[PDB]
Amino acid sequence: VKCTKARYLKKKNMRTLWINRITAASQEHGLKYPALIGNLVKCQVELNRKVLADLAIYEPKTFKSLAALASRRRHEGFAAALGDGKEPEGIFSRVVQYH
């Protein structure tokens, strides 16, 4: 019975582990977990926690590029919040449409 119920905990504890490793890799670049995940979705980059945590360990130069992208998209959001719509959208804030 423990082995049958442990298949829900394994999946849960994995995602908890990934998030802890992403949080740690984002603080090295002066970012917080919500600002990385939330702003990578705004750049249409659909990378899950498992892959992100693997990149922070084995591809550090790629994870800093992803953090700089999230920080760039985050700063464009603030700039747009100061304007009233007149200023155009940012370069990395554009959205590719699929019909």
Q: Which residues contact RNA by CB under 7 A?
A: 4-5, 7-8, 10-12, 14-16, 18-19, 33-34, 37-38, 41, 48-50
Going by the DSSP 8-state scheme, the letter that residue 91 receives in this structure is S
> Measured from the CB atom, is 10 or 99 closer to RNA?
10
Entry field: residues in the chain: 99
Any contact of residue 58 with another protein (CB under 8 A)? Answer: yes
Residue type, 18: W
User: Mind spelling out the 3-state secondary structure of 27-43?
Assistant: HCCCCCHHHHHHHHHCC
Q: Rule CB under 8 A: which residues touch another protein?
A: 3, 28-29, 56-62, 64
